């Protein structure tokens, strides 16, 4: 018989922690990672590639796989940390599109002010609430239990019966809908100012603020008001437990006209690289990390730096005067 | 046992001046059969029941040769000389009856698994005689090797002296040689790498240049592992040119030098030929 | 580290007994595929080794499809394919609804029109499929014109 | 190591009734390859890098066979049974990895120059087992002979008992035989030509016709060259049918007669079977 | 088996409630590690049978040791004997098994553990089935103290930046100039936390008769206790803090743990190792 048998878990926060760290690790020049993103392979996977249902071959990782990916590479683009943001899935009160706009489950996080139907309050950016408590009547995820409280006493999920009457409101620390009456209670987080909403937010994913960037303005994020008791905090992402970072990048034909030219079959596959070094005429010369935003693959040293992530797609065709955008996210 | 014909050779006066196919149609018959003996010699003749020695499963040549395994029904017939056989008598004791041979005719046989016992003996008839063997020799030895050689054929008389050997074991001598006892009157001889044997037995003979003084002793040694020593027992001492009943004509000393058991043979007499010969050894391996 | 995913559309396109043309969907590029055959019945009963049945492989393959002519007419056989390429976890070993290749099936085909074949030829050569009857490529053929 | 195919045989149903050249064009491929194994067996396979065993420099057959010499790179692959090899480990200790064999499968190997040492050991893997050898056997012996024989194959189990022998030396017995002590009660037996050995050791067993009286002694002799004598040492005396603690069941006397060391074995008892067997000998050659 | 842990502000609180004691971690107690496998070790299977790209330590032990007067060696095995077994049962050729990419298990064992600083060695010329690539040598002091017989410790690049020699890496060839990114080559995904518990810092839990601590928790960046909450926060330097001397809930605990009870005792010295696989 097994003598010792033990149990241990990592908190979801540690996901976040890695991220926040990982966010720290992109450097400017020195001793912190620098990131280039690359596309290539005009060459067709196979004649099918155009047709529907075609799945390009699953990429290969090897010094061989590297070389090949490194071989075809059309172009390269750097990444500034400010294009990297933490994000959580956006969910708006009252939104028809998505299921149960009016039915919220405990700890769900609800955005307000996002949309006209959503919007309670004018002259304010988007709001972010989390829903602490849900109506008592409902159904339990564990089929054995018909009581919310009993469902939760065991800890199984609970879905409430009664829909929300109104989207949550108030800066107020507790303050969902407590006095007059409702089944839901709502927790407030911070408010999002519109420009960032507009520029950052994807209707699936709100963009979540950095603790650092927060240190600058607690107000612009509406966080200044509260109560922390740890003093300054700003570690808000811990509270929301965002595990997801959004890479944003912008491709333009101009840096790489050659792959942009009419008749290019476009690039099949994508690759990101970290801390590559410049090309050098003399191999004894000291290595140089790459400042400029784009490099033709030539101007980069062969194989310098490490590429973490490789990708293969059906061909995508860049075109001149087009401006194409790439987003890649990460859950650590 | 696949039967072989002797060598059968092609006519070259045929071919380009005669009917090509026919003369060749014949030649293959030779060639095919010709290699058969070859591969049947150095490979299992039971591979003929296979693709007839053809294919990758076909008979292969063994630079060591192959000892042909068969039923007893086949050895129930006088078996020709020159053949290598492997039969295991675990099933039963067998007679291997052999044709009347010729002077120089050999018969090689083995039991590889050593199933041969008294319960699994092996009888042999080589026609008209086997030297030293009245009637048919029986073989009860496991892992033995049956080698007959016909030392007389003459007219009717096939005389087979007989050799047999354990198919395995340690048969080597670590040290055998001869030298002359130095002007220094001694030397040191590496015998074996000190680890090779727990026991050895050797025979040294120290003989004068003119051969009149010749020294002999019976050398039994115990290699001492932990102490890196070798313990000796000498007895049955014999001499010829001995001038003294004490140590005479030479002396025998031992040591382990340079990871070698090293005998130091010292003779007060100069010009003493000493032949160092290790007749038997022993080492311990694993249990079982 | 992850599976060569699978073929999706996987089928035996035609049955001429002891022969199959199997169609699996091509899925990803430069993925060879691991085509198996397994045995429903022992001919004693059916699916007697429902599980525990033997497997035999046709090897990895190229393209999206493989043509297969072997074994017995009328008999039920499992076949299984697994996609693969160099650096992957292995595929799922996908199964068919299988089949049995019926009885006698043979060729239905064109030739140069004027020619008139002798039934017994194909009658043996194809309906019974035996190549020994005439192993054509090798064999020698008298060609006799006629009164 | 030049690879051999098995026997590959020609179709005679071809030829005169079929296309001559083609069927022959095939046959040569056989024949050529066919002799290759043959000559590669009994000659250097490094002669294939030569004219491919052709020409006067080409592989020749050795009635003794040839022990194939090669690089270690080739033995870096499991080496097939049936092969004779000669490799010298002076360069380095080697492993000779051997395929899983069959009952009766042999592997013959030698180091001719005897370069094998502990500095030049020899490792062997015969798949799944070698009888008596846990893991891979190592061979440090110079002038040894590596002979493996697979004494069990079975399903997965290739059991190799193992024989090894010094490639050289004097392994003969000058005198071994058996006789019955005469009505005269004695005889004289030429043992070896008086010059053949400075030392010999033999074992005589004198046993009654009914086997009840059987005499045994431990015979150690010093051949006396100048005096044409032989000096004996007898000890460890053992008997069965002994009626007296004195010389009993027979007597052992020695002499040199007719340029033969001649033992004279005298038994007061008639009908005594005496087996004369010389177990070990020694002679002195030149120094070094 | 203790009840499966729970992650929550509640679960935190409880763990934060019972917490006996706290210990810091210096980065020098953090090492990259890979699973140790030594050439020739009888106990464990196939001491002599290596698979392509396996990583082999040499000199670790007498049977291992080829060479005295050098720290441990780390070789990787490029090529394996031709005869062997394929992971894919369909293929009898190593080359074909691998050309397709299925794993191959070689039949023939290695003669000797590899040697030489040079680039693939591999016992390639004279003969062998294995070929060997050299990596770096581990100096003895670090070996003895760091190494767990399952996991060798792998050097940091910075720490590498200090001595290429003490790690035996100075010898090679990088052609990028300094490189030192060696850990990429070994692809260690696993860090070993090492920590040291001592009764002395926490005698109270050390006293005779304690039933010991059930469960373990690590925390990152806690702040000191303050008498006055308006006072500025302070991160925690000292090696140990009574949970009291730490602010309630301060810092984040990534990793929670539950065990059958372990009983500490005074003058006993308890050790913890933790390995994260990223």
Swiss-Prot record, chain A:
This is Baseplate wedge protein gp8. It is found in: Virion. Intermediate baseplate protein. Involved in the tail assembly. One of its GO terms (cellular component) is virus tail, baseplate. Pfam families: Phage-Gp8 (PF09215). Keywords: Disulfide bond, Viral baseplate protein, Viral release from host cell, Viral tail assembly, Viral tail protein, Virion. Homodimer. Interacts with gp7. Part of the baseplate macromolecular complex which consists of gp5, gp5.4, gp27 (central spike complex); gp6, gp25, gp53 (inner baseplate); gp7, gp8 (intermediate baseplate); gp9, gp10, gp11, gp12 (peripheral); gp48 and gp54 (proximal region of the tail tube). SUPFAM superfamilies: Baseplate structural protein gp8 (SSF89433). Its main location: virion. The keyword ATP-binding does not apply. The keyword RNA-binding does not apply. GO terms for biological process: viral tail assembly. Belongs to the tevenvirinae baseplate structural protein gp8 family. Disulfide bonds join 140-151. It comes from the Viruses. Induction: Expressed in the late phase of the viral replicative cycle. InterPro entries: Gp8_sf (IPR036327), Phage_T4_Gp8 (IPR015298).
Swiss-Prot record, chains B, D:
One of its GO terms (cellular component) is virus tail, baseplate. Keywords: Coiled coil, Viral baseplate protein, Viral release from host cell, Viral tail assembly, Viral tail protein, Virion. Its main location: virion. Residues 20-80 form a coiled coil. Signal peptide: none annotated. GO terms for biological process: viral release from host cell; viral tail assembly. Induction: Expressed in the late phase of the viral replicative cycle. It is found in: Virion. InterPro entries: Baseplate_gp9_C, Baseplate_struct_prot_Gp9/10_N, Gp9-like_sf, Gp9/Gp10_mid_dom_sf, Gp9_C_dom_sf. Homotrimer. The gp9 trimer interacts with the long tail fiber (LTF) that comprises gp34 trimer, gp35, gp36 and a gp37 trimer. Part of the baseplate macromolecular complex which consists of gp5, gp5.4, gp27 (central spike complex); gp6, gp25, gp53 (inner baseplate); gp7, gp8 (intermediate baseplate); gp9, gp10, gp11, gp12 (peripheral); gp48 and gp54 (proximal region of the tail tube). Peripheral baseplate protein that is part of the tail fiber network. Connects the long tail fibers to the baseplate and, after virus attachment to a host cell, probably changes its conformation to trigger the signal for tail contraction. Involved in the tail assembly. The C-terminus is bound to the baseplate, and the N-terminus coiled-coil domain is associated with the long tail fibers. This is Baseplate protein gp9. It comes from Enterobacteria phage T4 (Bacteriophage T4).
Curated annotation (Swiss-Prot), chain C:
Heterotrimer with gp6; assembles as a (gp6)2-gp7 heterotrimeric molecule. The (gp6)2-gp7 heterotrimeric molecule further interacts with gp25 and gp53. The gp25-(gp6)2-gp7 module is involved in sheath contraction. Interacts with gp8. Binds to gp10 homotrimer; disulfide-linked. Heteromultimer with gp10; a gp10 molecule is disulfide-linked to gp7 and the other two remaining gp10 molecules form a disulfide bond. It comes from Enterobacteria phage T4 (Bacteriophage T4). The gene is 7. Belongs to the T4likevirus baseplate wedge protein gp7 family. The chain holds residues 2 to 148 of 1032 of the full protein. Transmembrane segments: none annotated. It is found in: Virion. It comes from the Viruses. This is Baseplate wedge protein gp7. Intermediate/inner baseplate protein. The gp25-(gp6)2-gp7 module is involved in sheath contraction. Involved in the tail assembly.
């Amino acid at each position: 018989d097994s003598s010792v048998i033990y149990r241990a878990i990592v908190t979801s926060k540690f996901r976040t922690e890695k991220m926040l760290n990982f966010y720290n690790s992109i450097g400017s020049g020195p001793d912190k990672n620098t990131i280039f993103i690359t596309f290539g392979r005009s060459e067709p996977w196979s004649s099918n590639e155009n047709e529907v249902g075609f799945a390009p071959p699953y990429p290969t990782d090897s010094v061989l796989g590297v070389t090949d990916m490194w071989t075809h590479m059309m172009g390269t683009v750097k990444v500034l940390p400010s294009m990297l943001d933490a994000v959580i899935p956006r969910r708006d009160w009252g939104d028809t599109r998505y299921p149960d706009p009016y039915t919220f489950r405990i700890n769900d996080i609800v955005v307000c002010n996002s949309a006209p139907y959503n919007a309670t309050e004018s002259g304010a950016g988007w709001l972010v609430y989390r829903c602490l408590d849900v109506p008592d009547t409902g159904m339990c995820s564990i089929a054995s239990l018909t009581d919310k409280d009993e469902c939760l006493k065991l800890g199984g999920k609970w879905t409430p019966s009664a829909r929300s009457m109104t989207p949550p409101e108030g800066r107020g620390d507790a303050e969902g809908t407590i006095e007059p009456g409702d089944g839901y209670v709502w927790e407030y987080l911070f408010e999002i100012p519109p420009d960032v909403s507009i520029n950052r937010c994807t209707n699936e994913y709100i963009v979540v603020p950095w603790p650092e960037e927060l240190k600058e303005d607690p107000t612009r994020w509406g966080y200044e008001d509260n109560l922390t008791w740890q003093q300054d905090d700003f570690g808000l992402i811990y509270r929301v437990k965002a595990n997801t970072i959004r890479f944003k990048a912008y491709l333009d034909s101009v840096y790489f006209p050659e792959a942009a030219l009419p008749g290019n079959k476009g690039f099949r596959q994508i690759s990101i690289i970290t801390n590559p070094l410049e090309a050098k005429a003399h191999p004894n010369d000291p290595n140089v990390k790459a400042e400029k935003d784009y490099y033709d693959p030539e101007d980069l040293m062969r194989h310098s730096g490490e590429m973490i992530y490789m990708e293969n797609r059906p061909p995508i065709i860049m075109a001149m005067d087009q401006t194409e955008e790439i987003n890649i996210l990460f859950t650590f | 046992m696949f039967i072989q014909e002797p060598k059968k050779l092609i006519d070259t006066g045929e071919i380009g001046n005669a009917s090509t196919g026919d003369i060749l149609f014949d030649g293959g018959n030779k060639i095919n059969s010709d290699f058969n003996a070859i591969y049947n010699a150095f490979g299992d003749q039971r591979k003929m029941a296979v693709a007839n020695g053809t294919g990758a499963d076909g008979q292969i040549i063994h630079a060591t040769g192959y000892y042909q395994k068969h039923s007893i029904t086949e050895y129930a017939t006088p078996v020709k000389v020159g053949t290598r056989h492997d039969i295991d008598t675990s099933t039963v004791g067998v007679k291997v009856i052999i044709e009347r041979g010729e002077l120089g005719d050999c018969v090689e046989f083995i039991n590889s698994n050593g199933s041969i016992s008294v319960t699994n003996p092996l009888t042999i008839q080589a026609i008209d005689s086997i030297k030293g063997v009245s009637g048919n020799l029986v073989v009860t030895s496991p892992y033995s090797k049956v080698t007959l050689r016909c030392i007389s054929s003459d007219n009717s008389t096939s005389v087979w002296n007989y050799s047999i050997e354990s198919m395995f074991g340690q048969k080597e001598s670590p040290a055998e040689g001869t030298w002359n006892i130095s002007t220094s009157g001694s030397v040191d001889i590496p015998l074996f790498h000190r680890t090779e044997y727990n026991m050895a037995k050797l025979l040294v003979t120290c003989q004068s240049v003119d051969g009149r003084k010749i020294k002999t002793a019976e050398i039994n040694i115990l290699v001492d592992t932990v102490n890196s020593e070798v313990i000796s027992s000498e007895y049955a001492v014999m001499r010829v040119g001995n001038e003294t009943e004490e140590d005479e004509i030479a002396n025998i000393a031992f040591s382990i030098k340079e990871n070698y058991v090293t005998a130091t043979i010292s003779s007060s007499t100069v010009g003493m030929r000493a032949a160092v010969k290790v007749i038997a050894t022993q080492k311990i391996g694993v249990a079982q | 580290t992850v599976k060569a995913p699978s073929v999706t559309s996987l089928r035996i396109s035609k049955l001429s007994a002891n022969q199959v043309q199997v169609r699996w969907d091509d899925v990803g590029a430069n993925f060879y595929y691991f085509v198996e055959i397994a045995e429903t019945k022992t001919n004693s009963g059916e699916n007697l080794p429902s599980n525990q049945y033997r497997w035999i492989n046709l090897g990895y393959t190229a393209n999206n499809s493989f043509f297969f002519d072997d074994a017995d007419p009328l008999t039920t056989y499992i076949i299984r394919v697994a996609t693969a390429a160099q650096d992957f976890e292995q595929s799922d070993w996908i199964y068919t609804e299988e089949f049995e290749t019926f009885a006698t099936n043979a060729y239905t085909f064109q030739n140069m029109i004027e020619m008139q074949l002798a039934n017994k030829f194909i009658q043996e050569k194809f309906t019974l499929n035996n190549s020994d009857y005439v192993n054509f490529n090798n064999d020698t053929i008298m060609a006799a014109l006629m009164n």
